[PDB]
Amino acid sequence: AKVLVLYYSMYGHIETMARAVAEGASKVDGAEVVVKRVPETMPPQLFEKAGGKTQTAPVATPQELADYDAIIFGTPTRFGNMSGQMRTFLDQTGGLWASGALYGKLASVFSSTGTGGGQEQTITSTWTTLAHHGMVIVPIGYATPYGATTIAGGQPSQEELSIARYQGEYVAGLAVKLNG
Amino acid sequence: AKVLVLYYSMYGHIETMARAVAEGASKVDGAEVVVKRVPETMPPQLFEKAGGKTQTAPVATPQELADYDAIIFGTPTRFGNMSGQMRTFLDQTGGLWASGALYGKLASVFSSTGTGGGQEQTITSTWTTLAHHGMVIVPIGYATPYGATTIAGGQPSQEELSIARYQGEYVAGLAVKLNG
Amino acid sequence: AKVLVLYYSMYGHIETMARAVAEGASKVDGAEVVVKRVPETMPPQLFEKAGGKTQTAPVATPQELADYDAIIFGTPTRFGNMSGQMRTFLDQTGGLWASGALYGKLASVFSSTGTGGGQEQTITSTWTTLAHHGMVIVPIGYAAQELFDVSQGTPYGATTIAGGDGSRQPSQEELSIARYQGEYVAGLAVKLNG
Amino acid sequence: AKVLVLYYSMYGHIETMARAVAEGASKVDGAEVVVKRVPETMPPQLFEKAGGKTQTAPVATPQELADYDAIIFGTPTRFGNMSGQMRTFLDQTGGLWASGALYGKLASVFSSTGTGGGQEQTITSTWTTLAHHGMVIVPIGYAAQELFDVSQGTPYGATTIAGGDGSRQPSQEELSIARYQGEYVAGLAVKLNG
Numbered sequence: 115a116k117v118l119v120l121y122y123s124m125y126g127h128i129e130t131m132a133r134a135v136a137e138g139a140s141k142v143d144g145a146e147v148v149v150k151r152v153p154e155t156m157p158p159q160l161f162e163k164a165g166g167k168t169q170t171a172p173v174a175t176p177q178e179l180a181d182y183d184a185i186i187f188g189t190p191t192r193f194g195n196m197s198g199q200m201r202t203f204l205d206q207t208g209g210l211w212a213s214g215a216l217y218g219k220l221a222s223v224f225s226s227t228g229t230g231g232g233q234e235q236t237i238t239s240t241w242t243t244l245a246h247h248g249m250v251i252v253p254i255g256y257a258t259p260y261g262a263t264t265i266a267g268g269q270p271s272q273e274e275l276s277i278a279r280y281q282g283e284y285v286a287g288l289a290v291k292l293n294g
Numbered sequence: 295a296k297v298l299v300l301y302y303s304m305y306g307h308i309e310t311m312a313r314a315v316a317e318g319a320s321k322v323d324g325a326e327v328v329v330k331r332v333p334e335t336m337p338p339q340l341f342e343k344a345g346g347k348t349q350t351a352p353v354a355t356p357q358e359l360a361d362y363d364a365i366i367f368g369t370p371t372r373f374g375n376m377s378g379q380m381r382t383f384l385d386q387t388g389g390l391w392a393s394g395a396l397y398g399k400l401a402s403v404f405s406s407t408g409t410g411g412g413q414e415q416t417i418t419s420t421w422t423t424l425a426h427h428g429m430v431i432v433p434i435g436y437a438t439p440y441g442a443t444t445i446a447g448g449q450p451s452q453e454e455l456s457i458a459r460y461q462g463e464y465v466a467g468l469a470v471k472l473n474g
Numbered sequence: 475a476k477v478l479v480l481y482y483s484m485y486g487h488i489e490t491m492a493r494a495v496a497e498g499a500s501k502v503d504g505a506e507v508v509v510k511r512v513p514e515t516m517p518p519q520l521f522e523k524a525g526g527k528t529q530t531a532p533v534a535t536p537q538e539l540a541d542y543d544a545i546i547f548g549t550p551t552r553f554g555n556m557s558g559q560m561r562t563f564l565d566q567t568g569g570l571w572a573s574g575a576l577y578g579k580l581a582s583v584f585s586s587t588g589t590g591g592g593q594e595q596t597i598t599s600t601w602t603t604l605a606h607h608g609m610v611i612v613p614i615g616y617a618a619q620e621l622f623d624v625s626q627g628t629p630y631g632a633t634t635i636a637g638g639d640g641s642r643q644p645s646q647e648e649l650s651i652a653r654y655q656g657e658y659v660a661g662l663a664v665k666l667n668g
Numbered sequence: 669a670k671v672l673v674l675y676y677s678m679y680g681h682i683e684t685m686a687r688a689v690a691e692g693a694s695k696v697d698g699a700e701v702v703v704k705r706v707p708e709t710m711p712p713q714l715f716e717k718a719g720g721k722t723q724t725a726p727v728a729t730p731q732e733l734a735d736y737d738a739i740i741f742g743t744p745t746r747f748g749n750m751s752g753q754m755r756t757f758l759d760q761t762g763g764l765w766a767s768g769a770l771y772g773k774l775a776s777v778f779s780s781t782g783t784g785g786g787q788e789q790t791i792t793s794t795w796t797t798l799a800h801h802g803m804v805i806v807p808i809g810y811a812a813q814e815l816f817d818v819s820q821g822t823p824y825g826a827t828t829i830a831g832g833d834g835s836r837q838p839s840q841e842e843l844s845i846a847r848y849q850g851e852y853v854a855g856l857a858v859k860l861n862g
C-alpha cells in the first residue's frame with residue numbers, strides 16, 4: 115500500500131511531526147511511504163521577513179494525490195482552520211473531486227499549535243474537505259482523539275512524536291489491510 | 295462481518311431510512327445486518343402528546359455496540375445536533391470508551407431533517423463522538439457528502455432511500471473487506 | 475437586563491464554574507443574574523450510585539428561557555458534545571423556536587473536561603443550536619489581561635479540567651476566566667437592553 | 669458605526685451577494701458601509717483562463733479591518749471551508765490578533781455553493797476564526813418574515829446556489845435574505861457603537 119504524508123509547515127513544527135508520522139508508517143510491512151509538502155504561497159521575501167524555515171521536501175502537485183492508498187495531512191493550527199497554503203492546495207483538487215479519484219481512500223490529519231487552542235477545530239474542519247472527496251477518515255482516539263498534535267507555547271516533545279509515530283503506523287496498517 | 299444499524303426516530307423518518315440502510319448492507323455477501331433503536335427517553339404520555347410514532351425495533355443496550363464490525367447511526371436533526379435520545383444513549387458508552395471496545399471499528403451516520411438546515415452539523419457533530427471512541431468514520435462523498443439525509447418540509451423520497459441503500463451497501467462492503 | 479446562567483453538572487465542576495460566571499455577571503450594575511440547572515434525567519438511585527452531586531440550584535423549564543436577555547450555557551464535555559441532559563432540555567425548546575422567543579438574545583457557553591480533549595467541539599456544537607434560535611453568540615477570545623481578577627485555554631468559552639479521576643476542582647485561574655465571561659456577557663446585555 | 673462587507677468571489681456569486689448585504693446595511697441610518705474584496709491569489713492568466721470574473725471592489729488590506737465596528741465576511745464554499753483566498757488573507761491578521769484589534773466587534777458570514785453541500789460547514793468553520801479574534805458572531809436564524817423585502821436555507825448566514833455548472837445567479841428570494849443579514853448586522857452595530 116502507498117502512503118503519502120502531505121504537509122504544510124512555516125516554522126518547522128509540522129515538518130518535524132511529518133518525519134515522525136512517516137517513521138511510524140514505515141514500521142508497517144508492505145507500506146511504501148513518501149513525504150511531500152504543499153507549495154509555499156508567500157513570496158520568499160515575505161516568508162523570510164516572517165522568519166520562516168525554508169522547506170526542502172519535494173513539492174506535491176494536487177493531481178498526484180490520486181496515486182496513494184492513504185494520505186496523512188499535516189497543517190498548523192491557523193485560528194482553528196488549516197493554513198491558507200493547505201487550503202489553497204486543496205482548492206486545486208477540483209479535478210480529482212469531479213473524477214472521484216480520492217473516493218474511498220484513507221485520510222488522517224495531524225496538527226501543530228501554540229497554547230491558545232483551536233487544534234481540534236483545525237483537524238475536524240480539515241476532515242470536512244476530505245469527506246467531500248469521499249475519503250475514509252481515521253481519528254486516533256485515545257491513543258486529541260482527532261489526530262496527533264504538538265503544542266509549543268511562546269520543538270515537539272518525545273511523547274508528541276510517539277503519538278505521531280503511532281498515527282502513521284496505525285493508518286499504514288489499515289492501508290495494507292485494505293489494499294495489500 | 296457484523297453491521298449494526300442503530301437509530302433514533304420520533305416521527306418515523308429515520309425509521310424508514312434505517313430500513314433502507316439495512317437493505318443496502320444486506321446486499322453484501324458476508325454482512326450480517328441487524329437494526330436496533332436507542333430507547334425513547336420521553337415518558338409514553340409525553341411521546342403520545344407530541345404525536346410520536348411508536349417504535350417497535352429491538353432496543354439496543356450501550357454495551358452491545360462492541361459486538362459489531364460497523365455501526366451506522368441514524369438520528370434526526372435537532373437544531374444541528376443529534377437528538378437528546380441518541381446523546382443520552384451515547385453518554386452511556388463510557389464503559390466501552392475506557393475499555394477501547396469500539397476502537398478501529400467502522401462508523402457512519404445518516405440523518406433526517408426539515409427544510410431549515412442543520413443536517414450537516416448533525417452528522418459532523420455525531421462524528422466527533424465516534425472519533426472519541428477511535429472509530430473509523432465513513433462519509434459518502436458525492437454518491438451531503440457526509441451521510442444520507444431525508445428532507446421533509448411542512449415520507450422519504452425514492453432518491454433519498456436509494457442513497458441510504460448505497461450508504462449501507464458501501465459501509466457493509468468495507469466491513470467485509472476489513473473483517474471477512 | 476436579565477441574565478440566566480443555565481447549566482448541567484453531574485459531579486459539580488460545571489456547577490462551580492456556573493457560580494463563577496454568575497459572580498462575574500453580578501458585577502454589572504443593571505444586570506439581574508440568576509442560576510438554574512436543567513433537570514437530571516438519570517433515575518436518582520443510579521445517579522447517587524454513580525457518585526453524582528446533588529445541587530441547590532432551581533430547575534429551569536424550557537419556557538422560561540424567553541424571559542432573559544442573555545443566556546450563558548454550561549455543560550460538561552461528553553465525547554465532544556454537550557451532555558444528554560442539556561441536549562434533551564434544548565430539544566424541548568421547539569415552541570420557543572417557532573415563536574422567535576430567543577431571536578437576537580445573547581448566548582455564550584462554558585464547559586469542563588476530564589483531560590482536555592473535545593472541549594472545543596462541545597462549545598462550537600452548542601453554538602450551532604443557539605444559532606438555530608437566532609441567538610447572538612459571544613466567544614471569549616483572549617481578553618485584555620487586566621480584565622481578569624487573577625494575574626495570568628480556548629477562545630470559545632471558559633473551561634476547566636476535572637482530571638481523569640474527576641477529583642480536580644477548578645483553579646482560581648480557570649474561575650477567573652469564567653468570572654470574566656459572565657461580566658463580559660452581562661455588560662453586553664445591559665448595553666443592548668438597559 | 670462603520671460596517672465592512674469583506675468578500676472573496678471567483679465567478680461573481682458572492683460578489684452579487686455582497687452587494688445585497690451592503691444594500692441592506694445601507695438602510696440603517698448611521699451605518700457607513702463599504703464593500704471590499706480580498707486579493708485574488710491565482711496568477712491573472714490562470715484566473716482568466718478559468719473563467720474568473722474581474723471585479724470593481726477595492727482590495728482590502730488585513731490592517732484596515734481594525735477600522736470597522738462590524739465585518740460581514742463572504743466566501744464561496746470550497747469543500748466545506750472558506751476559500752484559499754479568504755484563508756490566506758485571514759492568516760495575515762496575526763498582528764491584529766496580538767493587539768486585540770478585532771475583539772468584541774461584530775462578525776457575520778454569508779456563502780455560496782454549487783449544489784448545496786458544505787455550506788453549513790463553510791459558515792461555522794469561518795466562525796471559528798472570528799472567535800479567535802474575540803468577535804461577536806451574528807447568525808441569522810429564521811427572522812420574522814415581515815423583515816424580508818421579498819415575501820417568503822440555513823440559520824447560520826445567507827447563501828445562494830450557483831448550480832453545478834456555475835451558471836445560476838442569485839434569486840430575489842436569496843438576495844432578500846442577504847439584504848436582511850446586512851440590515852440586521854448594521855442595526856446591531858449602530859446600537860452598540862452609535
Ligand SMILES: Cc1cc2nc3c(=O)[nH]c(=O)nc-3n(C[C@H](O)[C@H](O)[C@H](O)COP(=O)(O)O)c2cc1C
Pocket residue numbers: 122123124125126127128129190191192193194226227228229230231232233266758759760761762800
Ligand atoms: C496566522 C496564525 C494563526 C495562528 N493561530 C493559532 C491558533 O488558533 N491557536 C494556537 O494556539 N496557535 C496558533 N498559531 C500558532 C501555530 O499554530 C504554531 O506556531 C505552530 O507550531 C506552527 O507550525 P509550523 O512550525 O509547522 O508552521 C497561529 C499562527 C499563525 C501564523
Ligand SMILES: Cc1cc2nc3c(=O)[nH]c(=O)nc-3n(C[C@H](O)[C@H](O)[C@H](O)COP(=O)(O)O)c2cc1C
Pocket residue numbers: 302303304305306307308309370371372373374406407408409410411412413446564565566567568606
Ligand atoms: C426539537 C427539534 C428540533 C429540530 N431541529 C431541526 C433543524 O435544526 N432543522 C430542520 O430542518 N429540522 C429540524 N427538526 C425537524 C426534524 O429534523 C424532522 O422532523 C425529521 O424528519 C424527524 O425525524 P424522525 O421522524 O425520524 O423523528 C427538529 C425537530 C425537533 C423536534
Ligand SMILES: Cc1cc2nc3c(=O)[nH]c(=O)nc-3n(C[C@H](O)[C@H](O)[C@H](O)COP(=O)(O)O)c2cc1C
Pocket residue numbers: 384385386387388426482483484485486487488489550551552553554585586587588589590591592593636640
Ligand atoms: C459519557 C462521558 C463522556 C465524557 N467525555 C469526555 C471527553 O470527551 N473528554 C474529556 O476530557 N472528558 C470527558 N468526560 C469527562 C467529563 O467531561 C467530566 O466528567 C465533566 O467535565 C465534569 O463536569 P461535571 O462535574 O460538571 O459533571 C466524559 C464523561 C462522561 C460521563
Ligand SMILES: Cc1cc2nc3c(=O)[nH]c(=O)nc-3n(C[C@H](O)[C@H](O)[C@H](O)COP(=O)(O)O)c2cc1C
Pocket residue numbers: 204205206207208246676677678679680681682683744745746747748779780781782783784785786787830834
Ligand atoms: C475547489 C472548489 C471546491 C468547491 N466545493 C464545493 C462544495 O463543497 N460544495 C458545493 O456545492 N460547491 C462547491 N464548489 C462550488 C463553489 O462553491 C462555487 O464555485 C461558488 O459558490 C461560486 O461562488 P463565486 O462565484 O462567488 O466564486 C467548489 C468550487 C471549487 C472551485
